[PDB]
Design an enzyme around this catalytic site. Structure first.
Site, short mmCIF file in Angstrom:
data_model
loop_
_atom_site.label_atom_id
_atom_site.label_comp_id
_atom_site.label_asym_id
_atom_site.label_seq_id
_atom_site.Cartn_x
_atom_site.Cartn_y
_atom_site.Cartn_z
CB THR A 118 -6.02 1.70 -0.66
OG1 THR A 118 -4.83 1.86 -0.03
CG2 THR A 118 -5.91 -0.05 -0.16
CG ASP A 129 -2.16 0.76 0.81
OD1 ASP A 129 -2.33 2.12 0.03
OD2 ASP A 129 -3.11 0.34 1.42
CG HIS A 138 -3.35 7.42 -1.69
ND1 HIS A 138 -4.99 6.66 -1.73
CD2 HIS A 138 -3.09 7.68 -0.26
CE1 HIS A 138 -4.74 6.42 -0.39
NE2 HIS A 138 -4.20 6.25 0.03
CG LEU A 149 -18.73 0.09 -23.98
CD1 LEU A 149 -19.62 -1.16 -24.84
CD2 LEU A 149 -17.42 -0.72 -25.02
CG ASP A 183 -2.19 0.35 -3.41
OD1 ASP A 183 -1.05 0.79 -2.88
OD2 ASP A 183 -2.96 0.27 -2.29
C1 LIG Z 1 -14.92 -3.10 -19.47
O1 LIG Z 1 -15.00 -4.24 -19.21
C2 LIG Z 1 -16.06 -4.98 -18.85
C3 LIG Z 1 -16.17 -6.85 -18.74
O2 LIG Z 1 -15.58 -7.31 -20.25
C4 LIG Z 1 -17.00 -4.50 -19.86
O3 LIG Z 1 -18.57 -4.62 -19.25
C5 LIG Z 1 -19.11 -5.56 -19.54
O4 LIG Z 1 -19.12 -4.66 -21.08
C6 LIG Z 1 -20.51 -5.61 -21.18
C7 LIG Z 1 -21.96 -4.37 -22.45
O5 LIG Z 1 -22.43 -3.09 -21.55
C8 LIG Z 1 -21.98 -5.79 -20.79
O6 LIG Z 1 -22.91 -7.01 -21.31
C9 LIG Z 1 -24.12 -6.69 -20.70
O7 LIG Z 1 -24.53 -7.36 -19.54
C10 LIG Z 1 -25.69 -7.71 -19.07
C11 LIG Z 1 -25.86 -9.21 -17.76
O8 LIG Z 1 -25.74 -8.56 -16.56
C12 LIG Z 1 -25.12 -8.93 -15.47
O9 LIG Z 1 -24.34 -10.39 -15.67
C13 LIG Z 1 -22.62 -10.40 -15.98
C14 LIG Z 1 -22.64 -11.46 -16.44
O10 LIG Z 1 -21.54 -12.52 -15.28
C15 LIG Z 1 -21.89 -9.30 -14.80
O11 LIG Z 1 -20.84 -8.80 -15.55
C16 LIG Z 1 -22.72 -8.62 -14.61
O12 LIG Z 1 -22.29 -7.10 -13.54
C17 LIG Z 1 -22.46 -6.11 -13.41
O13 LIG Z 1 -23.72 -5.99 -12.77
C18 LIG Z 1 -23.77 -6.76 -11.35
C19 LIG Z 1 -25.24 -6.22 -10.35
O14 LIG Z 1 -25.85 -5.78 -10.67
C20 LIG Z 1 -22.49 -6.05 -10.69
O15 LIG Z 1 -21.82 -6.47 -8.81
C21 LIG Z 1 -21.10 -5.34 -10.96
O16 LIG Z 1 -20.42 -4.83 -10.85
C22 LIG Z 1 -21.39 -5.54 -13.11
O17 LIG Z 1 -21.94 -4.27 -12.90
C23 LIG Z 1 -21.30 -3.30 -13.85
O18 LIG Z 1 -22.23 -3.38 -15.55
C24 LIG Z 1 -23.02 -3.29 -15.86
C25 LIG Z 1 -23.63 -3.28 -16.72
O19 LIG Z 1 -23.68 -4.96 -16.93
C26 LIG Z 1 -23.55 -1.38 -15.42
O20 LIG Z 1 -24.92 -1.25 -15.91
C27 LIG Z 1 -22.67 -1.26 -13.83
O21 LIG Z 1 -22.70 0.78 -13.99
C28 LIG Z 1 -21.28 -1.68 -14.13
O22 LIG Z 1 -20.64 -0.79 -14.57
C29 LIG Z 1 -24.41 -8.46 -14.51
O23 LIG Z 1 -24.74 -9.22 -13.27
C30 LIG Z 1 -26.87 -8.21 -20.14
O24 LIG Z 1 -27.95 -8.17 -19.44
C31 LIG Z 1 -26.72 -6.75 -21.18
O25 LIG Z 1 -28.01 -7.90 -22.24
C32 LIG Z 1 -28.39 -6.70 -22.81
O26 LIG Z 1 -27.74 -5.76 -23.92
C33 LIG Z 1 -27.90 -6.48 -25.08
C34 LIG Z 1 -26.91 -6.37 -26.05
O27 LIG Z 1 -25.63 -7.89 -26.49
C35 LIG Z 1 -29.18 -7.16 -25.56
O28 LIG Z 1 -29.24 -7.97 -26.47
C36 LIG Z 1 -29.75 -7.76 -24.33
O29 LIG Z 1 -31.50 -8.11 -24.76
C37 LIG Z 1 -30.12 -6.75 -23.03
O30 LIG Z 1 -30.74 -5.48 -22.69
C38 LIG Z 1 -32.13 -6.31 -21.79
O31 LIG Z 1 -31.34 -5.14 -21.04
C39 LIG Z 1 -31.66 -3.71 -20.96
C40 LIG Z 1 -31.66 -3.16 -19.50
O32 LIG Z 1 -32.21 -3.30 -19.07
C41 LIG Z 1 -32.96 -3.08 -21.54
O33 LIG Z 1 -32.71 -1.45 -22.07
C42 LIG Z 1 -33.80 -3.95 -23.38
O34 LIG Z 1 -34.21 -3.40 -23.69
C43 LIG Z 1 -32.58 -5.26 -22.76
O35 LIG Z 1 -34.17 -5.90 -21.43
C44 LIG Z 1 -25.19 -6.50 -21.38
O36 LIG Z 1 -25.21 -7.79 -22.97
C45 LIG Z 1 -21.48 -6.92 -19.68
O37 LIG Z 1 -22.20 -6.49 -17.80
C46 LIG Z 1 -20.05 -5.75 -18.94
N1 LIG Z 1 -19.00 -6.51 -17.44
C47 LIG Z 1 -18.88 -6.01 -16.31
C48 LIG Z 1 -18.08 -7.58 -15.46
O38 LIG Z 1 -19.21 -4.99 -15.98
C49 LIG Z 1 -16.80 -2.85 -20.11
O39 LIG Z 1 -18.21 -2.89 -21.37
C50 LIG Z 1 -15.50 -2.36 -20.28
N2 LIG Z 1 -15.42 -1.26 -20.46
C51 LIG Z 1 -14.84 -0.21 -21.17
C52 LIG Z 1 -14.78 1.34 -21.45
O40 LIG Z 1 -14.66 -1.16 -23.08
C1 LIG Z 2 -9.08 -5.50 3.17
C2 LIG Z 2 -7.04 -4.57 3.74
C3 LIG Z 2 -6.91 -5.60 4.34
N1 LIG Z 2 -6.24 -6.07 2.86
C4 LIG Z 2 -5.54 -7.81 2.57
O1 LIG Z 2 -4.61 -8.14 3.01
O2 LIG Z 2 -5.00 -8.05 0.96
C5 LIG Z 2 -4.39 -8.49 0.39
C6 LIG Z 2 -5.08 -8.70 -1.42
C7 LIG Z 2 -3.91 -8.53 -1.68
C8 LIG Z 2 -3.29 -8.41 -3.26
C9 LIG Z 2 -4.47 -7.83 -4.09
O3 LIG Z 2 -5.06 -7.44 -5.62
C10 LIG Z 2 -4.21 -8.63 -6.05
F1 LIG Z 2 -5.52 -9.55 -6.38
F2 LIG Z 2 -4.30 -8.26 -7.30
F3 LIG Z 2 -3.08 -9.23 -5.95
C11 LIG Z 2 -6.10 -8.13 -3.84
C12 LIG Z 2 -6.13 -8.96 -1.90
C13 LIG Z 2 -5.88 -5.38 1.49
C14 LIG Z 2 -6.61 -4.02 3.19
C15 LIG Z 2 -7.63 -2.75 2.81
N2 LIG Z 2 -7.37 -2.76 3.98
C16 LIG Z 2 -6.96 -1.26 4.82
O4 LIG Z 2 -7.34 -1.14 5.71
C17 LIG Z 2 -6.76 0.08 3.63
C18 LIG Z 2 -5.90 0.95 4.43
C19 LIG Z 2 -5.33 1.88 3.24
C20 LIG Z 2 -6.07 2.77 3.04
S1 LIG Z 2 -5.77 4.28 1.92
N3 LIG Z 2 -6.55 4.85 2.90
O5 LIG Z 2 -6.95 4.33 1.09
O6 LIG Z 2 -4.54 3.97 1.59
C21 LIG Z 2 -7.94 2.04 2.06
C22 LIG Z 2 -8.04 0.90 2.78
C23 LIG Z 2 -7.53 -3.27 4.82
#
Ligand SMILES: *[C@@H]1O[C@H](CO)[C@@H](O[C@@H]2O[C@H](CO)[C@@H](O[C@@H]3O[C@H](CO[C@H]4O[C@H](CO)[C@@H](O)[C@H](O[C@H]5O[C@H](CO)[C@@H](O)[C@H](O)[C@@H]5O[C@H]5O[C@H](CO)[C@@H](O)[C@H](O)[C@@H]5O)[C@@H]4O)[C@@H](O)[C@H](O[C@H]4O[C@H](CO)[C@@H](O)[C@H](O)[C@@H]4O[C@H]4O[C@H](CO)[C@@H](O)[C@H](O)[C@@H]4O)[C@@H]3O)[C@H](O)[C@H]2NC(C)=O)[C@H](O)[C@H]1NC(C)=O
Ligand SMILES: C[C@@]12CN(C(=O)OCc3ccc(OC(F)(F)F)cc3)C[C@H]1CN(C(=O)c1ccc(S(N)(=O)=O)cc1)C2
Ligand SMILES: [Ca+2]
Ligand SMILES: [Cl-]
Ligand SMILES: [K+]
Ligand code: NA
Ligand SMILES: [Zn+2]
Length: 805
Positions: free
Chosen positions: A159, A121, A420, A689, A308
């Site tokens: 972090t 860190d 930071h 995108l 980080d």
């Molecule tokens: C960086 O890399 C990442 C990873 O490759 C890129 O992100 C991907 O982009 C894809 C395109 O946008 C996207 O695909 C969509 O996925 C939908 C399914 O979503 C779930 O399943 C996946 C798979 O395991 C999962 O990863 C998702 O996780 C997200 O959501 C959870 C909980 O909500 C979060 O914990 C997690 O952080 C993550 O959130 C992020 O992504 C979502 C979008 O999914 C954002 O909203 C958040 O802000 C956040 O950033 C999900 O749990 C799928 O349903 C989509 O399908 C729609 O579009 C297609 C086109 O093919 C269409 O055919 C379908 O009909 C459908 O449309 C329907 O839904 C619409 C909305 O409800 C509606 O308007 C319509 O009318 C329809 O009903 C789509 O395929 C993919 O999920 C993400 N993956 C991740 C991990 O983020 C990213 O683009 C890259 N960035 C750059 C700059 O390149």
């Molecule tokens: C929770 C945690 C203990 N942790 C841990 O044992 O991590 C293992 C790990 C290693 C690599 C990894 O990366 C991958 F996968 F690529 F290898 C992922 C996890 C992380 C620490 C942050 N933490 C803090 O208290 C903390 C400290 C400072 C700040 S700040 N103010 O923003 O600087 C914010 C939070 C307690």
């Protein structure tokens, strides 16, 4: 409830976790109040400390000791890390010469070289040089392995967002950990450093390395360490795990150090108190490497030493207060510190207005140390907008500063000298990368790269297929001796049309005029050849970009430039032209000032029209190939084609015209010629995108001409600047930008001054990777060079940062 009455006997730092109310013995039980009664006694032994001494050598095993110097310790896998040094006349790992590790040299039963991620860190990039005298173990890893001069973190440079980006390959916007502090309005829950909500699974998106490993049959050490478990015990635990039987032993491990961040916050990045934390981290690395050497693992394990984020000098007195700008300060919630995020305190207050908040925060004080943004107007390189957890109003805080709501917030909640979180281009925020092991290169320096790239490489080191992520797989192949990933270029989805002269002038009723009616058979074969693509090898240096989605478009050739013209968006997707060092800038002749000319290769129905611009009081127009850089008076006419026109706000035309009239020539002069590809970007839902046509929120009034959200340029030349851009034999040099297409220049506080005082500063702020432009356009650039594809991938990830040394 945890019934804390079971026992840790034989279970210390167990790898699979058991479910409450069974009591836990894992390296996370502390943080849950769930450890068995005897956890400390059995698992956190401390007796006699961490090192063997002469008199302990060959002792009788005493199970109470923290570590052991008895004869059976090696096969028990629980010697102190210096056991062989003290008792068997061995040298410390740091004292051995480095010897190239050409192949993994592993004990029998190891199926793959293990990976150890040693994350520190707050380890600022310049510590490698500035602390070199007190870090001999780290310095040996660095000079004998593969190292970057620094590694770029993600924004915000905190972090949690950075460690989870390391683990996933994702931008914080996609993984969901968008700060150290968050409110998710859909959950109606808050995430904080302190407390229990952060342990809930719904915060953590994407697919972290330990899950990617587990799903594909690779066992993982548990990544996270409870704060009270001392560093020495973490190391010994990793080393014990490495002595497990083959079927039980993990292949990937993580160590985490709270230092030097913890001390950096208190004393500043280079406080005299910083030497000791650096010495102690080095000693820990020493302990790990000696322990691996004992286990004959030091020429078998791949070790990644990674930070980080860095650390900057920040003090209480360098705080801006929102109460000096806003009257309504009590109607807002601020996420404060080295970034600002603003939302309404109550969603029942319909008197709250984001427009008036932003206006009250915009250029109000001569030396103002933050700049307010709607999140979708943040530089696209930050990729910080597409998440409901990221508030619409954001403040980018100057390095060395804090923002707070009210002065009371700073003295009723100077402590700190370091912090930071700032823009990830900032030097003081850069961190470290070292890879050392059989799979990394020997004594190799690689260029700086972004931490979003490492997930792919850790998957490569482990033979895993990476989950979909934001790295560009192959761009870090040059770090690796073996296990490279060999990508193919994406296939082109849409092939262009090559239209010839198909329309008579009078078929167009676009309301455009040009003063161009002038009457030669020598120059007639000549203009014919230019329109057929005769000069194309001059202006299209790396092949045409491939269109990676389904669309209808035309290649258009001209003397001075080539374009790929979209029949759907009514403008080019890309315009390519080369400006040699010798090229001259001319002006737009008076008679040609308002000239727009129908393009006889392109149907009226697929053309913009001048009327729409006349009618649209907000919107004007500019050209993608600049008329200023025309090769000849006759060639200049091509620049005024309706097919080279794009919609521009007058405020943006100030920026664009200065770039095209002054800056392109300046770069060609400095870089010995440049090739330029420019075009529009449409990102109305700010997901980074390319938008489909049904996502466009704004058109030129009364028309189907869509308004770009951004304009990009990619400016390429020869890395060896003794060669001109159009006759380059080796590696390329690139810089790019994605400029926001805004109706005002509110972002630039000095905009009422001459473009020479503010335009270049704005462009620098919006510097971009070619990869960012690829995502935003659905294009794939550099399809035809004489360079290897991995080299081109690295080039496409390059970011020109405009920070000094
Ligand atoms: C960086 O890399 C990442 C990873 O490759 C890129 O992100 C991907 O982009 C894809 C395109 O946008 C996207 O695909 C969509 O996925 C939908 C399914 O979503 C779930 O399943 C996946 C798979 O395991 C999962 O990863 C998702 O996780 C997200 O959501 C959870 C909980 O909500 C979060 O914990 C997690 O952080 C993550 O959130 C992020 O992504 C979502 C979008 O999914 C954002 O909203 C958040 O802000 C956040 O950033 C999900 O749990 C799928 O349903 C989509 O399908 C729609 O579009 C297609 C086109 O093919 C269409 O055919 C379908 O009909 C459908 O449309 C329907 O839904 C619409 C909305 O409800 C509606 O308007 C319509 O009318 C329809 O009903 C789509 O395929 C993919 O999920 C993400 N993956 C991740 C991990 O983020 C990213 O683009 C890259 N960035 C750059 C700059 O390149
Ligand atoms: C929770 C945690 C203990 N942790 C841990 O044992 O991590 C293992 C790990 C290693 C690599 C990894 O990366 C991958 F996968 F690529 F290898 C992922 C996890 C992380 C620490 C942050 N933490 C803090 O208290 C903390 C400290 C400072 C700040 S700040 N103010 O923003 O600087 C914010 C939070 C307690
Ligand atoms: Ca989009
Ligand atoms: Cl935060
Ligand atoms: K207009
Ligand atoms: Na301004
Ligand atoms: Zn910190």
């Amino acid at each position: 409830w945890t019934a804390t009455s079971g026992s840790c006997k034989g279970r210390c730092f167990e790898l699979q976790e058991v479910g409450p109310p069974d009591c836990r013995c894992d390296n996370l039980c502390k943080s849950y109040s769930s450890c068995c009664h005897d956890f400390d006694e059995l698992c956190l032994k401390t007796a006699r400390g961490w090192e063997c001494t002469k008199d302990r050598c060959g002792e009788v095993r005493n199970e109470e000791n923290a570590c052991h110097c008895s004869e059976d310790c090696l096969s028990r896998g629980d010697c102190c890390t210096n056991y062989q040094v003290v008792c068997k006349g061995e040298s410390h790992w740091v004292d051995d010469d480095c010897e190239e590790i050409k192949v993994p040299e592993c004990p029998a039963g190891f199926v793959r070289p293990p990976l150890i991620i040693f994350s520190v860190d707050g380890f600022r990039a310049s510590y490698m040089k500035k602390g070199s005298k007190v870090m001999p173990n780290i310095e040996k890893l660095r000079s004998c392995g593969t190292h970057a001069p620094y590694m770029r973190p993600v924004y915000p440079t905190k972090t949690f967002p950075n460690l989870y980006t390391l683990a996933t390959g994702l931008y914080p916007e996609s993984h969901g950990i968008v700060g150290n502090s968050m409110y998710d309005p859909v959950f109606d829950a808050s995430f904080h450093l302190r407390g229990r909500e952060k342990f809930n699974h719904r915060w953590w998106g994407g697919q972290p390395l330990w899950i990617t490993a587990t799903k594909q049959g690779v066992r993982a050490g548990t990544f996270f360490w409870s704060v009270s478990i001392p560093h020495e015990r973490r190391i010994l635990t990793i080393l014990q795990w490495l002595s497990l039987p083959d079927n039980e032993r993990p292949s990937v491990y993580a160590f985490y150090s709270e230092q030097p961040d913890f001390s950096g916050h208190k004393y500043g990045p280079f406080g005299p108190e910083m030497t000791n934390p650096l010495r102690e981290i080095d000693k820990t690395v020493g302990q790990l490497m000696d322990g691996l050497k004992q286990l004959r693992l030091h020429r078998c394990v791949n070790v990644i030493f990674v930070g980080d984020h860095g650390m900057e000098d920040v003090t209480c007195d360098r705080t801006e207060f929102l109460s000096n700008y806003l009257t309504n300060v009590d109607d807002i919630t601020l996420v404060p510190g080295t970034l600002g995020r603003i939302r309404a305190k109550s969603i029942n207050n319909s008197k709250y207005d984001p427009k008036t908040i932003i206006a009250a925060l915009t250029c109000k004080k001569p030396d103002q140390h933050f700049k307010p943004y709607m999140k979708q107007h943040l530089p696209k390189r930050l990729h910080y907008a597409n998440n409901r957890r990221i508030e619409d109003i954001h403040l980018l805080v100057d390095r060395r500063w804090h923002v707070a709501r009210k002065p009371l917030d700073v003295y009723k909640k100077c402590f700190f000298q370091g912090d930071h979180g700032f823009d990830n281009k900032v030097n003081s925020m850069q961190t470290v990368f070292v890879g050392y092991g059989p799979t990394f290169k020997y004594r190799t320096k690689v260029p700086p790269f972004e931490n979003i790239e490492l997930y792919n490489v850790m998957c490569d080191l482990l033979g895993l297929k990476p989950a979909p992520n934001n790295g560009t797989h192959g761009s870090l192949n040059h770090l690796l001796r073996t296990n490279t990933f060999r990508p193919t270029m994406p296939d082109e989805v849409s092939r262009p049309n090559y239209p010839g002269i198909m329309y008579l002038q009078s078929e167009f009723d676009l309301g455009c005029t040009c003063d161009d009616k002038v009457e030669n058979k020598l120059e007639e074969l000549n203009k014919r050849l230019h329109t057929k693509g005769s000069t194309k090898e001059r202006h299209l240096l790396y092949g045409r970009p491939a269109v990676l989605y389904r669309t209808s478009y035309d290649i258009l050739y001209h003397t001075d430039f080539e374009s790929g013209y979209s029949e759907i968006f009514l403008m080019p997707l890309w315009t390519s032209y080369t400006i040699s060092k010798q090229a001259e800038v001319s002006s737009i002749p008076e008679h040609l000032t308002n000239c727009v000319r129908p393009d006889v290769r392109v149907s009226p129905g697929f053309s913009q029209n001048c009327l729409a611009y006349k009618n649209d009081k907000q919107m004007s127009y500019g050209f993608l190939f600049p008329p200023y850089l025309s090769s000849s008076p006759e060639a200049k006419y091509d620049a005024f084609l309706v097919t080279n026109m794009v919609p521009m706000y007058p405020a943006f035309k100030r920026v664009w015209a200065y770039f095209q009239r002054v800056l392109v020539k300046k770069y060609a002069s400095e870089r010995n010629g440049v090739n330029v590809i420019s075009g529009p970007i449409f990102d109305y839902n700010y997901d980074g995108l390319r938008d489909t046509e049904d996502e466009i929120k704004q058109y030129v009034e009364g028309s189907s001409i869509p308004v770009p959200t951004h304009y990009y340029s990619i400016i390429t030349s020869c890395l060896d600047f003794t060669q001109p851009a159009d006759k380059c034999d080796g590696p390329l040099s690139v810089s790019s930008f994605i400029l926001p297409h805004r109706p005002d220049n509110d972002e630039s506080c000095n905009s009422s001054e001459d473009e020479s005082k503010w335009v270049e500063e704005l462009m620098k702020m919006h510097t971009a990777r070619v990869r960012d432009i690829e995502h935003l356009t659905g294009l794939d650039f550099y399809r035809k060079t004489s360079r290897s594809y991995s080299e081109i991938l690295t080039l496409k990830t390059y970011l020109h940062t405009y920070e000094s040394e």
